[PDB]
């Protein structure tokens, strides 16, 4: 998996390749890694997918729950106190490594979340078993003063760095930009680098091919009137 | 402790004509979650219009393939120039696997070429030795996933003629060099999308009367 | 335990299990009934660790009994399976599960049909014309794959019967001292006692 | 894998299944599990595929070199005994072997012996060796007599490993037949289970658990 | 079977249009420790290979003694030692990788990644990988241990396959090997700062260059990092 | 990680370095070690991230709340915090932790709390994987009642060895000063710290 | 010893024009033995299908449980649930049991009453939805229905068509695994009928 | 292998040896003879380890039948027997020792006594009355213990032998198929075809 | 163990403790680790006493039969033979021997062979158990050419502090300098090195 986070001058953009793998077996062609906690806090998440879920939608549900109480926008220093705190109390098992982004009355963050429980601080990060393809580009190429349309193609490039490199990492790159006074803008399957070519041959088969022992109709409507 | 073995993934598939024989292979090389080459070729000829692929530990297979091209080469000198027929270097190649019974080439060894009737013909290996000619024969990471695709699109495995249901089988009918070629690209680009250590590269060799043809064609690089 | 068979035929069920109880070097009985009646058209056999067996199969006869009682009322042999299946896949993640395998025929009344259930600890229930637990269907089932057609007799099925403990006793190794049969059908259970 | 050779009146019959697994993974299910040593002799084999092929090819050499050197075919005896007392030099280094040596000679008559990577080495009428050798056993010991046809026997070993190849997870494929006589071994050809199965079911009315 | 003591980490290398770049850190790491400051871990042999050496220490010296005494032999009643009959890379590579699965096969192996990076005869580029499996692989871009990771992923941006071979200078080339360098410092921790760079080009030979320094570093934005979450100051 | 904390004559100073590793990978080459639990109350963290983290938050609350009762707490009563965490827990924490806090009364003052929840108060106190490899300089270099130039340099000095030998501790040096005057954060880069 | 392959088995998905199907085998094994020829693996709750692969007594388990759930549902909600809102039912079912899990490959196979529009979803055993648009695949043959699949498959196939490709699929795959076959069952559904066919297959 | 009995007699010794093979689930033979011929007058049964044991009978089988021509002369039951206990004892220290106990019974011509050794694969030799390898003993020690004379006929013998397989027959949990009994006296070897 | 190997402008001295234990317990408290090969090459030994005197009875040997074929042998052709011992045996070995001496032409040098037996020729060099501690110290300490007396005062606060701080390392600081002028052995005794 490679997921990104990338700080710019009026926000911040994460980033995820689209990969979920069973051994060397690739289970999900096109995952959804980026995970909505509320409005404008998003996380990308790596490790176990169903950890990543679940623990976004606990926390996105009792952040929903807390900006209802408190009559406020949500803040993403609540979100990763609630999801580190989470993560802590099951001692790793929860095998989720979350990159947490977001805007809010205080204003544009970026942090990191490890399955422990263990929180870091960044103008740039990444995670999963491509973040050393990814951080490659990111300390090759970031600077202070990034502009949204630099830090999209940051972030992005250091995912493709990912998808190519790392075999646990593949398909297609997502994106979620999160700019200060504005709609955050969820870019499903930004870049799609990996079609598949036209197969040579038809595998449509003639009909009447199979060998069938019994037919029968399935009753799936409800106990009838008269 | 040192483990002796690694596996360096790939995947190979040979497939035996009327009158040819394919051995195809991608190029990928892997250690783990890293690629270490994109383009590593991995099937060869051995000469005598004989082609082999020995898949799995690179190690053990650039070995064993090495040993048997000796093999070809000394059995020229001690045999005044005499061909090796494509069954007895699958005899020899089983003393050379099983020579090393009780510290195995880790390798899934496949050999491809003519009988001595001109008749196309594959030759399949396990890491110890024992062996048999196929029509059809998918070996390496990715074997699962294409050997049943080949049982049902080259031997009509399943498959029934239309308006009798189940009675009359599909004909063995033979299948061209373009036909096979066709089953071993999309054979692969299927391969490519559901395991992670085949893409980046297919290179095919092509076995007839008239010698060794090769082809290379592209794969997914992710 | 050892060797525990079932065969559902025309009209019956019929339940053959061993006799042998080994506790490690010897033999301490000859002549075990590993069985109990649920009900009177309802009967379980059972294989497995000792002291789980009868102390499930007891249990399993306690609540069955306490149900005909309340309702007046003998459940169906589906019905008894699924109780059975249920306390046995509640069972398997217990702290100590039971270690118990078991097989339930019964002669159902309303539909005036015969059923054989195969149960195993896990709680796998399996409705089938033949089963068996352990070892035995190793041996078994080949025979009954071929002998067996379904309008039996209950005489045929004995035969058939006796033509698989012949087979455990010439290729098993250990010698489980014969098996007790029983028949299950519309007129209830009973024993035969000769065999 | 599922094996079994029988003596009766009309000689031998040996009959084995094809399959070749890696686990769950079916790896052939075209396998030769039956070995002509010479037009006399034949192996079974089952466990190990590498060592029963190498060592059962490797037999023939031996027997072959028997009788260059004596003028003179080797007994059954002889054949099986080569065998089990190499396997017996490597015992313990982890060989995994279980073969019928079946055979006919002037001085012996029909013969089987079953030789083990254990060291094993027995003379019998009946065995069956593998994976699915008890379901073999049920059908072989039920219908078994010394005065079978020729036609008969065959098919009860056919039969047997049918039983096995249903019911045994690592046991299909197809069923290669022989029968061993005065005059040599006759292959009596391959019959794919997949054929074979609903033959025998329609014809002779068994499998009614089945549904076809 | 042993284990390895004193380490050295990532060799890095690719091609280039008239010849290969290969580099390799000075450190020589004892666990955690980074005890030797002035280990060399790039070994030239001859005028037109170099080999760069990761892993155990002891067997790199161990090797530099072997391709010393291979240069040694080579030289034995050969009067064209010096021309037609030299060393070359593919000869010096076969010579190790052989070595290497030998020892991997008496269970007593080498504890290294060997990258041989040179220019033949002809003038073709050589680069290949072995290592204490005897693995062999060869590819435009070669990398050991952390530059497998961090390293190719950089590289391969400028080669990504073999028709960009040619179209990649010298000085493209070079610059991308020490930003390579440059990465593995922020990012491996048992690498150091003063590293070798090696050049075999095809018309200037072999440039052998020494106590290499990562620069222009970016530091400065660690100052307005606070905390771990929630803290301010 | 090499972290330290020195008193002297006008209150206390902690230092630290910024790198976080797993195994031989360099997870974070800016982190932040040096951590608040009150105004004039920090801590320099060493071991586990996790549970330093999760351990400092919690004092951080404690003290929080001892402040809206009982006032401003002192730095030994942090320390004591710390304690009872680390030695009632020790079974299932992996965390090294100095104290350093402040007070107009007690002045600059340093507890070490290591693996097994013992607590320590020195003149000055060295602690993580990298310390190892400089108690013989901080030994032979320390003095009592240092000025703030002197300390710093003393912190500086130290460290850039620790950083040089261990490569578990690299990155920038961080250091807070502690003193009547406020609260204030230095920092020095490699460039700067390498070249001593 | 694990439970994912003691009692074998595989179940398949695909998706077509205006239809779907879902088709699992027969066989019901303790490793080796074969014991059943009449294990279905799939059920069904109102017109959503769930298929599911792995350890038998929690695929009969599981079964139970949905239809308890699936029947509250429609008592409460005074209508039959849907695929996708079944989908997160299946999901937090399984996640509630995280470090206890049952042992299956749930396949979820339907076609939305409302919208019309066709749906698969597959899942781990601890309730990862794995939403595809093409295929799902599950069970100890997974690897070869894999390969079968990303061969076979094409989109749009027509219902009789579309039967054609996911029966080749499954009797391939279970054909290269021992644990998988002695018989198959397909499911071919449209938006108000559904047809249900017994293939006939190799028997081993 | 399983049970192997001896007895010694008045004026014979009686060894008494189980039919059956079993390997694993399945009992492949069940007329099996756990014995070799080792001169005239002397004869060694045997059970253990698969293939050791055959293999160890028939190499000092092949020794003996070499010294008896060799020298023209038949070795003496002791003779014989502390030369099997030393192969067995130079065995049990070697890279793959022979897994095998023996019973060796034998007729000595010079004192005219039988004679019945019992040794185990360590190379622990012992004279007695009456011995037996394996679980056999458990049962069958406390039998002849009671029952035993030392003035028995040989049909005696046989009838307390009857008496020892019954209660194994009886107890032990494995089918061994009956024994094979050999008697070694004055006149030599000779099978008893009726047990 | 705390040893060390230091070259000066007149030659090179070597420098150790003299503490030797079996676990906690001090087996001999008056060791002697710096031992002679040859009359101006010496070696100071760390790890396993048994297999770093079997190592260097053998090297001795091998220096003798050396010198009554080719004459007087270089301190590398010594490190050589010490190296070639440990590195071929490194699985059966546990010795991390120093080795140090002076020729005319080439002057004071030092050869470190740790665990593993590769060969590392420096200015000076630190090993055992106690070095760990005064990496720092020795490191900002160490100038090249210095005097006699400079090298020695080096040599005993460096040793002092190791001793200090390692359990493994105590006793007396032994030394022995190699120059032109011979062979002189030095002794520190704790009342001494303690105060420094
Ligand atoms: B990535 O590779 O880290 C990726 C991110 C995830 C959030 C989609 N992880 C996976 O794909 C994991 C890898 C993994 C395998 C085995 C155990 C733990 C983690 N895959 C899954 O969680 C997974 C596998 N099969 C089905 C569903 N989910
Ligand atoms: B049979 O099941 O014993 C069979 C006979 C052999 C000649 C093919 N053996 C195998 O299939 C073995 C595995 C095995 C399964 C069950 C019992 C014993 C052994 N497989 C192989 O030897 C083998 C060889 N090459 C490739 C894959 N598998
Ligand atoms: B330091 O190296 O001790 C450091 C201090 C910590 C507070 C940042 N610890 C780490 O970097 C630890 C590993 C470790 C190293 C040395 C001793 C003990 C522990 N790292 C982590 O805990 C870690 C690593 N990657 C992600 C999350 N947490
Ligand atoms: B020193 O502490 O390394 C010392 C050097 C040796 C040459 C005298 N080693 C020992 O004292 C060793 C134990 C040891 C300590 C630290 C690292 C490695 C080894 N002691 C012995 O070998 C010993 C102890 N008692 C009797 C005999 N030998
Ligand atoms: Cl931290
Ligand atoms: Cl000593
Ligand atoms: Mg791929
Ligand atoms: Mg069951
Ligand atoms: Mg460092
Ligand atoms: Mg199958």
């Given at each position: 998996?490679?997921?990104?986070?990338?700080?710019?001058?009026?926000?911040?953009?994460?980033?995820?390749?689209?990969?979920?793998?069973?051994?060397?077996?690739?289970?999900?062609?096109?995952?959804?890694?980026?995970?909505?906690?509320?409005?404008?806090?998003?996380?990308?998440?790596?490790?176990?997918?169903?950890?990543?879920?679940?623990?976004?939608?606990?926390?996105?549900?009792?952040?929903?729950?807390?900006?209802?109480?408190?009559?406020?926008?949500?803040?993403?220093?609540?979100?990763?106190?609630?999801?580190?705190?989470?993560?802590?109390?099951?001692?790793?098992?929860?095998?989720?490594?979350?990159?947490?982004?977001?805007?809010?009355?205080?204003?544009?963050?970026?942090?990191?979340?490890?399955?422990?429980?263990?929180?870091?601080?960044?103008?740039?990060?990444?995670?999963?078993?491509?973040?050393?393809?990814?951080?490659?580009?990111?300390?090759?190429?970031?600077?202070?003063?990034?502009?949204?349309?630099?830090?999209?193609?940051?972030?992005?490039?250091?995912?493709?760095?990912?998808?190519?490199?790392?075999?646990?990492?593949?398909?297609?790159?997502?994106?979620?930009?999160?700019?200060?006074?504005?709609?955050?803008?969820?870019?499903?399957?930004?870049?799609?680098?990996?079609?598949?070519?036209?197969?040579?041959?038809?595998?449509?088969?003639?009909?009447?091919?199979?060998?069938?022992?019994?037919?029968?109709?399935?009753?799936?409507?409800?106990?009838?009137?008269? | 402790?040192?483990?002796?073995?690694?596996?360096?993934?790939?995947?190979?598939?040979?497939?035996?004509?009327?009158?040819?024989?394919?051995?195809?292979?991608?190029?990928?090389?892997?250690?783990?979650?890293?690629?270490?080459?994109?383009?590593?070729?991995?099937?060869?000829?051995?000469?005598?219009?004989?082609?082999?692929?020995?898949?799995?530990?690179?190690?053990?297979?650039?070995?064993?393939?090495?040993?048997?091209?000796?093999?070809?080469?000394?059995?020229?000198?001690?045999?005044?120039?005499?061909?090796?027929?494509?069954?007895?270097?699958?005899?020899?190649?089983?003393?050379?696997?099983?020579?090393?019974?009780?510290?195995?080439?880790?390798?899934?060894?496949?050999?491809?070429?003519?009988?001595?009737?001109?008749?196309?013909?594959?030759?399949?290996?396990?890491?110890?030795?024992?062996?048999?000619?196929?029509?059809?024969?998918?070996?390496?990471?990715?074997?699962?996933?294409?050997?049943?695709?080949?049982?049902?699109?080259?031997?009509?495995?399943?498959?029934?003629?239309?308006?009798?249901?189940?009675?009359?089988?599909?004909?063995?009918?033979?299948?061209?060099?373009?036909?096979?070629?066709?089953?071993?690209?999309?054979?692969?680009?299927?391969?490519?999308?559901?395991?992670?250590?085949?893409?980046?590269?297919?290179?095919?060799?092509?076995?007839?009367?008239?010698?060794?043809?090769?082809?290379?064609?592209?794969?997914?690089?992710? | 335990?050892?060797?525990?068979?079932?065969?559902?035929?025309?009209?019956?069920?019929?339940?053959?299990?061993?006799?042998?109880?080994?506790?490690?070097?010897?033999?301490?009985?000859?002549?075990?009934?590993?069985?109990?009646?649920?009900?009177?058209?309802?009967?379980?056999?059972?294989?497995?660790?000792?002291?789980?067996?009868?102390?499930?199969?007891?249990?399993?006869?306690?609540?069955?009994?306490?149900?005909?009682?309340?309702?007046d009322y003998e459940l169906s042999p589906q019905a008894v399976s699924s109780f059975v299946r249920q306390e046995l896949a509640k069972s398997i993640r217990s702290r100590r599960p039971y270690q118990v395998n078991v097989l339930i025929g019964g002669y159902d009344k309303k539909k005036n049909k015969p059923e054989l259930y195969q149960i195993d600890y896990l709680g796998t229930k399996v409705e089938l014309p033949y089963g068996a637990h352990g070892y035995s269907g190793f041996y078994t089932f080949?025979?009954?794959?071929?002998?067996?057609?379904?309008?039996?007799?209950?005489?045929?099925?004995?035969?058939?019967?006796?033509?698989?403990?012949?087979?455990?006793?010439?290729?098993?190794?250990?010698?489980?001292?014969?098996?007790?049969?029983?028949?299950?059908?519309?007129?209830?259970?009973?024993?035969?006692?000769?065999? | 894998?599922?094996?079994?050779?029988?003596?009766?009146?009309?000689?031998?019959?040996?009959?084995?299944?094809?399959?070749?697994?890696?686990?769950?993974?079916?790896?052939?299910?075209?396998?030769?599990?039956?070995?002509?040593?010479?037009?006399?002799?034949?192996?079974?084999?089952?466990?190990?595929?590498?060592?029963?092929?190498?060592?059962?090819?490797?037999?023939?050499?031996?027997?072959?070199?028997?009788?260059?050197?004596?003028?003179?075919?080797?007994?059954?005896?002889?054949?099986?005994?080569?065998?089990?007392?190499?396997?017996?030099?490597?015992?313990?280094?982890?060989?995994?072997?279980?073969?019928?040596?079946?055979?006919?000679?002037?001085?012996?008559?029909?013969?089987?012996?079953?030789?083990?990577?254990?060291?094993?080495?027995?003379?019998?009428?009946?065995?069956?060796?593998?994976?699915?050798?008890?379901?073999?056993?049920?059908?072989?010991?039920?219908?078994?007599?010394?005065?079978?046809?020729?036609?008969?026997?065959?098919?009860?070993?056919?039969?047997?490993?049918?039983?096995?190849?249903?019911?045994?997870?690592?046991?299909?494929?197809?069923?290669?037949?022989?029968?061993?006589?005065?005059?040599?071994?006759?292959?009596?050809?391959?019959?794919?289970?997949?054929?074979?199965?609903?033959?025998?079911?329609?014809?002779?009315?068994?499998?009614?658990?089945?549904?076809? | 079977?042993?284990?390895?003591?004193?380490?050295?980490?990532?060799?890095?290398?690719?091609?280039?249009?008239?010849?290969?770049?290969?580099?390799?850190?000075?450190?020589?790491?004892?666990?955690?420790?980074?005890?030797?400051?002035?280990?060399?871990?790039?070994?030239?042999?001859?005028?037109?290979?170099?080999?760069?050496?990761?892993?155990?220490?002891?067997?790199?010296?161990?090797?530099?003694?072997?391709?010393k005494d291979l240069v040694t032999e080579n030289a034995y009643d050969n009067p064209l030692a010096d021309a037609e009959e030299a060393l070359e890379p593919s000869y010096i590579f076969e010579y190790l990788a052989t070595v290497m699965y030998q020892r991997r096969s008496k269970m007593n192996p080498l504890w290294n990644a060997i990258i041989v990076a040179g220019v033949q005869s002809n003038g073709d580029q050589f680069l290949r990988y072995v290592n204490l499996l005897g693995v062999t692989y060869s590819s435009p871009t070669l990398a050991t241990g952390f530059g497998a990771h961090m390293a190719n992923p950089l590289l391969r941006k400028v080669v990504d396959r073999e028709?960009?071979?040619?179209?990649?200078?010298?000085?493209?080339?070079?610059?991308?090997?020490?930003?390579?360098?440059?990465?593995?410092?922020?990012?491996?921790?048992?690498?150091?700062?003063?590293?070798?760079?090696?050049?075999?080009?095809?018309?200037?030979?072999?440039?052998?260059?020494?106590?290499?320094?990562?620069?222009?570093?970016?530091?400065?934005?660690?100052?307005?990092?606070?905390?771990?979450?929630?803290?301010?100051? | 990680?090499?972290?330290?904390?020195?008193?002297?004559?006008?209150?206390?100073?902690?230092?630290?370095?910024?790198?976080?590793?797993?195994?031989?990978?360099?997870?974070?080459?800016?982190?932040?070690?040096?951590?608040?639990?009150?105004?004039?109350?920090?801590?320099?963290?060493?071991?586990?991230?996790?549970?330093?983290?999760?351990?400092?938050?919690?004092?951080?609350?404690?003290?929080?709340?001892?402040?809206?009762?009982?006032?401003?707490?002192?730095?030994?009563?942090?320390?004591?915090?710390?304690?009872?965490?680390?030695?009632?827990?020790?079974?299932?924490?992996?965390?090294?932790?100095?104290?350093?806090?402040?007070?107009?009364?007690?002045?600059?003052?340093?507890?070490?709390?290591?693996?097994?929840?013992?607590?320590?108060?020195?003149?000055?106190?060295?602690?993580?994987?990298?310390?190892?490899?400089?108690?013989?300089?901080?030994?032979?270099?320390?003095?009592?009642?240092?000025?703030?130039?002197?300390?710093?340099?003393?912190?500086?000095?130290?460290?850039?060895?620790?950083?040089?030998?261990?490569?578990?501790?690299?990155?920038?040096?961080?250091?807070?000063?502690?003193?009547?005057?406020?609260?204030?954060?230095?920092?020095?880069?490699?460039?700067?710290?390498?070249?001593? | 010893?694990?439970?994912?392959?003691?009692?074998?088995?595989?179940?398949?998905?695909?998706?077509?024009?205006?239809?779907?199907?879902?088709?699992?085998?027969?066989?019901?094994?303790?490793?080796?033995?074969?014991?059943?020829?009449?294990?279905?693996?799939?059920?069904?709750?109102?017109?959503?299908?769930?298929?599911?692969?792995?350890?038998?007594?929690?695929?009969?388990?599981?079964?139970?449980?949905?239809?308890?759930?699936?029947?509250?549902?429609?008592?409460?909600?005074?209508?039959?649930?849907?695929?996708?809102?079944?989908?997160?039912?299946?999901?937090?079912?399984?996640?509630?049991?995280?470090?206890?899990?049952?042992?299956?490959?749930?396949?979820?196979?339907?076609?939305?009453?409302?919208?019309?529009?066709?749906?698969?979803?597959?899942?781990?055993?601890?309730?990862?939805?794995?939403?595809?648009?093409?295929?799902?695949?599950?069970?100890?043959?997974?690897?070869?229905?894999?390969?079968?699949?990303?061969?076979?498959?094409?989109?749009?196939?027509?219902?009789?068509?579309?039967?054609?490709?996911?029966?080749?699929?499954?009797?391939?795959?279970?054909?290269?695994?021992?644990?998988?076959?002695?018989?198959?069952?397909?499911?071919?559904?449209?938006?108000?009928?559904?047809?249900?066919?017994?293939?006939?297959?190799?028997?081993?």
């Open positions: 998996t490679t997921i990104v986070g990338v700080k710019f001058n009026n926000g911040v953009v994460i980033a995820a390749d689209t990969r979920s793998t069973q051994g060397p077996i690739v289970a999900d062609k096109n995952c959804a890694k980026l995970h909505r906690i509320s409005p404008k806090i998003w996380c990308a998440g790596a490790g176990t997918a169903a950890d990543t879920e679940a623990v976004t939608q606990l926390i996105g549900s009792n952040i929903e729950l807390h900006s209802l109480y408190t009559s406020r926008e949500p803040r993403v220093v609540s979100a990763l106190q609630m999801l580190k705190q989470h993560l802590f109390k099951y001692q790793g098992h929860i095998g989720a490594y979350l990159i947490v982004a977001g805007v809010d009355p205080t204003g544009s963050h970026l942090f990191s979340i490890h399955a422990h429980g263990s929180t870091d601080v960044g103008y740039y990060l990444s995670l999963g078993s491509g973040s050393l393809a990814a951080m490659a580009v990111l300390e090759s190429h970031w600077k202070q003063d990034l502009t949204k349309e630099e830090a999209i193609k940051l972030a992005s490039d250091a995912i493709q760095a990912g998808i190519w490199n790392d075999l646990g990492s593949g398909s297609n790159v997502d994106v979620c930009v999160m700019e200060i006074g504005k709609d955050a803008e969820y870019l499903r399957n930004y870049l799609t680098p990996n079609v598949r070519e036209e197969k040579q041959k038809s595998y449509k088969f003639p009909r009447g091919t199979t060998a069938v022992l019994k037919e029968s109709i399935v009753n799936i409507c409800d106990i009838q009137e008269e | 402790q040192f483990n002796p073995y690694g596996d360096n993934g790939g995947t190979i598939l040979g497939i035996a004509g009327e009158d040819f024989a394919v051995l195809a292979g991608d190029t990928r090389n892997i250690t783990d979650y890293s690629i270490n080459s994109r383009y590593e070729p991995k099937v060869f000829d051995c000469g005598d219009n004989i082609v082999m692929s020995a898949n799995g530990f690179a190690a053990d297979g650039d070995a064993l393939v090495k040993r048997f091209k000796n093999s070809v080469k000394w059995y020229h000198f001690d045999h005044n120039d005499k061909k090796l027929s494509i069954n007895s270097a699958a005899r020899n190649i089983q003393h050379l696997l099983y020579g090393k019974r009780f510290f195995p080439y880790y390798v899934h060894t496949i050999i491809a070429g003519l009988d001595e009737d001109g008749k196309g013909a594959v030759y399949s290996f396990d890491p110890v030795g024992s062996y048999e000619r196929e029509q059809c024969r998918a070996g390496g990471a990715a074997a699962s996933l294409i050997m049943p695709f080949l049982d049902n699109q080259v031997n009509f495995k399943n498959q029934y003629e239309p308006g009798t249901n189940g009675k009359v089988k599909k004909p063995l009918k033979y299948l061209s060099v373009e036909e096979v070629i066709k089953l071993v690209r999309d054979s692969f680009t299927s391969a490519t999308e559901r395991h992670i250590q085949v893409g980046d590269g297919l290179e095919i060799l092509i076995v007839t009367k008239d010698g060794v043809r090769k082809e290379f064609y592209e794969l997914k690089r992710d | 335990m050892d060797i525990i068979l079932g065969i559902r035929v025309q009209d019956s069920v019929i339940l053959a299990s061993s006799k042998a109880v080994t506790r490690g070097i010897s033999v301490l009985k000859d002549s075990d009934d590993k069985t109990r009646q649920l009900s009177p058209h309802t009967l379980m056999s059972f294989a497995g660790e000792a002291g789980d067996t009868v102390q499930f199969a007891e249990y399993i006869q306690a609540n069955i009994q306490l149900y005909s009682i309340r309702e080949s025979l009954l794959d071929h002998h067996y057609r379904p309008d039996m007799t209950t005489e045929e099925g004995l035969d058939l019967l006796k033509l698989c403990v012949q087979e455990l006793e010439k290729r098993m190794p250990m010698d489980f001292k014969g098996v007790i049969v029983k028949i299950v059908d519309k007129d209830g259970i009973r024993q035969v006692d000769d065999f | 894998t599922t094996t079994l050779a029988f003596r009766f009146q009309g000689g031998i019959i040996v009959a084995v299944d094809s399959r070749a697994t890696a686990g769950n993974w079916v790896a052939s299910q075209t396998v030769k599990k039956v070995i002509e040593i010479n037009p006399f002799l034949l192996g079974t084999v089952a466990g190990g595929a590498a060592d029963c092929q190498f060592w059962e090819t490797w037999l023939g050499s031996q027997c072959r070199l028997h009788e260059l050197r004596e003028k003179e075919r080797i007994s059954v005896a002889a054949a099986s005994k080569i065998l089990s007392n190499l396997v017996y030099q490597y015992k313990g280094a982890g060989l995994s072997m279980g073969t019928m040596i079946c055979g006919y000679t002037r001085k012996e008559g029909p013969t089987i012996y079953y030789v083990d990577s254990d060291g094993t080495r027995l003379k019998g009428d009946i065995f069956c060796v593998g994976s699915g050798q008890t379901f073999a056993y049920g059908v072989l010991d039920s219908n078994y007599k010394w005065d079978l046809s020729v036609e008969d026997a065959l098919y009860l070993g056919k039969r047997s490993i049918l039983a096995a190849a249903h019911r045994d997870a690592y046991s299909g494929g197809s069923v290669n037949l022989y029968h061993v006589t005065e005059d040599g071994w006759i292959y009596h050809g391959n019959h794919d289970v997949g054929e074979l199965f609903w033959k025998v079911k329609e014809e002779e009315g068994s499998f009614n658990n089945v549904i076809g | 079977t042993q284990q390895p003591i004193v380490t050295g980490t990532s060799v890095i290398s690719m091609k280039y249009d008239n010849g290969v770049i290969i580099a390799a850190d000075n450190l020589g790491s004892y666990g955690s420790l980074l005890r030797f400051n002035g280990v060399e871990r790039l070994i030239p042999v001859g005028d037109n290979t170099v080999v760069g050496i990761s892993g155990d220490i002891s067997d790199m010296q161990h090797i530099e003694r072997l391709l028709s960009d071979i040619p179209k990649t200078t010298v000085q493209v080339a070079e610059e991308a090997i020490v930003n390579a360098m440059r990465v593995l410092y922020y990012r491996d921790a048992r690498s150091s700062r003063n590293f070798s760079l090696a050049i075999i080009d095809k018309n200037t030979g072999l440039t052998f260059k020494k106590n290499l320094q990562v620069e222009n570093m970016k530091w400065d934005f660690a100052k307005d990092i606070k905390g771990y979450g929630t803290q301010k100051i | 990680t090499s972290i330290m904390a020195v008193t002297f004559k006008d209150g206390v100073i902690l230092g630290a370095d910024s790198r976080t590793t797993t195994g031989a990978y360099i997870a974070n080459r800016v982190t932040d070690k040096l951590t608040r639990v009150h105004d004039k109350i920090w801590c320099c963290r060493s071991g586990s991230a996790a549970d330093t983290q999760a351990i400092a938050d919690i004092v951080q609350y404690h003290l929080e709340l001892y402040t809206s009762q009982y006032g401003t707490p002192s730095t030994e009563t942090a320390a004591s915090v710390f304690k009872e965490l680390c030695y009632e827990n020790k079974d299932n924490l992996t965390a090294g932790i100095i104290v350093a806090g402040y007070d107009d009364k007690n002045k600059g003052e340093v507890y070490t709390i290591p693996l097994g929840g013992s607590v320590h108060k020195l003149p000055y106190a060295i602690a993580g994987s990298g310390s190892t490899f400089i108690y013989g300089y901080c030994d032979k270099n320390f003095r009592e009642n240092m000025s703030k130039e002197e300390t710093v340099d003393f912190i500086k000095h130290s460290l850039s060895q620790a950083i040089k030998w261990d490569g578990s501790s690299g990155g920038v040096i961080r250091m807070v000063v502690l003193t009547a005057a406020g609260v204030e954060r230095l920092i020095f880069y490699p460039d700067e710290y390498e070249q001593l | 010893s694990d439970p994912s392959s003691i009692n074998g088995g595989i179940v398949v998905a695909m998706t077509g024009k205006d239809c779907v199907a879902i088709a699992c085998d027969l066989r019901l094994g303790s490793q080796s033995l074969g014991v059943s020829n009449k294990f279905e693996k799939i059920f069904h709750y109102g017109h959503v299908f769930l298929g599911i692969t792995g350890l038998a007594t929690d695929v009969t388990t599981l079964n139970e449980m949905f239809r308890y759930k699936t029947n509250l549902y429609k008592l409460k909600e005074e209508r039959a649930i849907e695929p996708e809102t079944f989908t997160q039912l299946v999901s937090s079912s399984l996640y509630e049991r995280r470090f206890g899990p049952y042992f299956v490959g749930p396949v979820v196979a339907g076609i939305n009453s409302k919208s019309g529009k066709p749906f698969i979803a597959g899942f781990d055993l601890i309730g990862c939805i794995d939403e595809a648009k093409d295929f799902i695949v599950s069970g100890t043959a997974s690897d070869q229905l894999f390969g079968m699949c990303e061969s076979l498959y094409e989109p749009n196939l027509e219902p009789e068509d579309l039967f054609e490709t996911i029966s080749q699929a499954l009797l391939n795959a279970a054909d290269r695994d021992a644990l998988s076959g002695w018989g198959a069952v397909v499911y071919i559904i449209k938006k108000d009928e559904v047809v249900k066919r017994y293939l006939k297959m190799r028997q081993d």
